[PDB]
Amino acid sequence: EDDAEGHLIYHVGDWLQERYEIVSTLGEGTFGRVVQCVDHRRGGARVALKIIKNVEKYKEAARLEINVLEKINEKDPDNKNLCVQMFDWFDYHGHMCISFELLGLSTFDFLKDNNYLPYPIHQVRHMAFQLCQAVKFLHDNKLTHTDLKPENILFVNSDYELTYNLEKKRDERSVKSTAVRVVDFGSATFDHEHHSTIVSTRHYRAPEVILELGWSQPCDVWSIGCIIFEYYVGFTLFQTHDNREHLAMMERILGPIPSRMIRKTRKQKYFYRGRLDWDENTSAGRYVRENCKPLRRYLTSEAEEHHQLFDLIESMLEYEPAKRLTLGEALQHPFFARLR
Numbered sequence: 001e002d003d004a005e006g007h008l009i010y011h012v013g014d015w016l017q018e019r020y021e022i023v024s025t026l027g028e029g030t031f032g033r034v035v036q037c038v039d040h041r042r043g044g045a046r047v048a049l050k051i052i053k054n055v056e057k058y059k060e061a062a063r064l065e066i067n068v069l070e071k072i073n074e075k076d077p078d079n080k081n082l083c084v085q086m087f088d089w090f091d092y093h094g095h096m097c098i099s100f101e102l103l104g105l106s107t108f109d110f111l112k113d114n115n116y117l118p119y120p121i122h123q124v125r126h127m128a129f130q131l132c133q134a135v136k137f138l139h140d141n142k143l144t145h146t147d148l149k150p151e152n153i154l155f156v157n158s159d160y161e162l163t164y165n166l167e168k169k170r171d172e173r174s175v176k177s178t179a180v181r182v183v184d185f186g187s188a189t190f191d192h193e194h195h196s197t198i199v200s201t202r203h204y205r206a207p208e209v210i211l212e213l214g215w216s217q218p219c220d221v222w223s224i225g226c227i228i229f230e231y232y233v234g235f236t237l238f239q240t241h242d243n244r245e246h247l248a249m250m251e252r253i254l255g256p257i258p259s260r261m262i263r264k265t266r267k268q269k270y271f272y273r274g275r276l277d278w279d280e281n282t283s284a285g286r287y288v289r290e291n292c293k294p295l296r297r298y299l300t301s302e303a304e305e306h307h308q309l310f311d312l313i314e315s316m317l318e319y320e321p322a323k324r325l326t327l328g329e330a331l332q333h334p335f336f337a338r339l340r
């Protein structure tokens with residue numbers, strides 16, 4: 001039973017593979033749905049079962065995802081490295097199904113449910129540290145995630161308490177535990193594997209990707225910089241869907257693009273006389289000037305720990321991928337010193 005768009009039709013209480021009993025729907029996307037199940041072959045443990053649509057290209061994509069997930073499990077037998085656990089996978093009549101550990105809301109959905117009020121700095125610290133650990137493990141194992149964003153980082157448990165923010169005169173939802181996992185390995189790429197030309201969701205996309213200079217592990221670090229900023233202020237760093245505007249936003253926030261990258265890119269339509277072809281005195285240019293500013297201007301406190309966070313973000317947003325902070329270096333940053 002498939003619907004017109006290729007989704008599996010199910011009802012609460014259905015069993016799949018005489019094993020997975022459907023309890024509720026956790027979420028839905030273009031690729032399929034994730035459903036909460038009781039796994040009766042695992043002592044009744046609750047799992048998140050991803051049911052991919054009956055679509056040949058999605059099926060093929062899921063097989064690659066499964067291979068990355070299998071590599072993760074293999075290299076992490078004690079489940080230490082903060083990437084989601086796949087417990088099982090099967091082909092269910094064309095629908096690829098992947099059984100995952102059951103987690104809570106994504107960091108995006110939690111942020112959204114909290115009216116986009118940012119995470120406090122001590123939570124940003126722990127969340128950022130875990131994000132760096134999880135992706136370092138990937139990078140250590142010749143993998144690049146390529147699609148890191150707040151939607152793909154879930155809280156292990158998103159139970160919260162109401163806290164009052166005196167500065168903002170509002171109630172805030174405060175997650176009880178900041179434990180997180182990186183999910184969605186559908187785009188993850190091994191060093192030796194065919195690389196897609198364009199990767200990452202627009203807002204999180206590295207300049208070497210936009211400029212088609214080649215990409216590898218460092219493009220994840222750029223995304224991470226963008227994510228950490230979004231946790232701290234609550235809005236996306238690069239709110240644009242246009243390459244040239246995106247590049248102009250980078251220049252306003254971070255300063256001019258290095259000449260070597262400009263010289264090397266085939267994307268010469270974006271450039272004039274060796275610099276970005278952007279007129280700040282147009283309305284397009286006015287928009288960028290009014291809707292973003294130099295990176296450090298986003299600090300909400302002059303206290304040292306806030307400056308330390310921005311030191312880290314700034315290093316992660318180094319234009320040159322070979323000069324960019326590696327995650328091994330990031331884990332040693334002074335910003336993380338306050339963490340246990």
Ligand SMILES: O=C(O)c1ccc2c(c1)nc(Nc1cccc(Cl)c1)c1ccncc12
Pocket residue numbers: 026027028029032033034048050084100101102103104154183184185
């Ligand atoms: O892809 C994975 O690796 C992946 C792995 C695990 C979960 C997931 C995606 N998505 C969840 N929720 C969710 C929320 C919104 C939309 C959609 Cl489709 C799914 C979810 C919830 C609870 N526990 C584990 C997961």
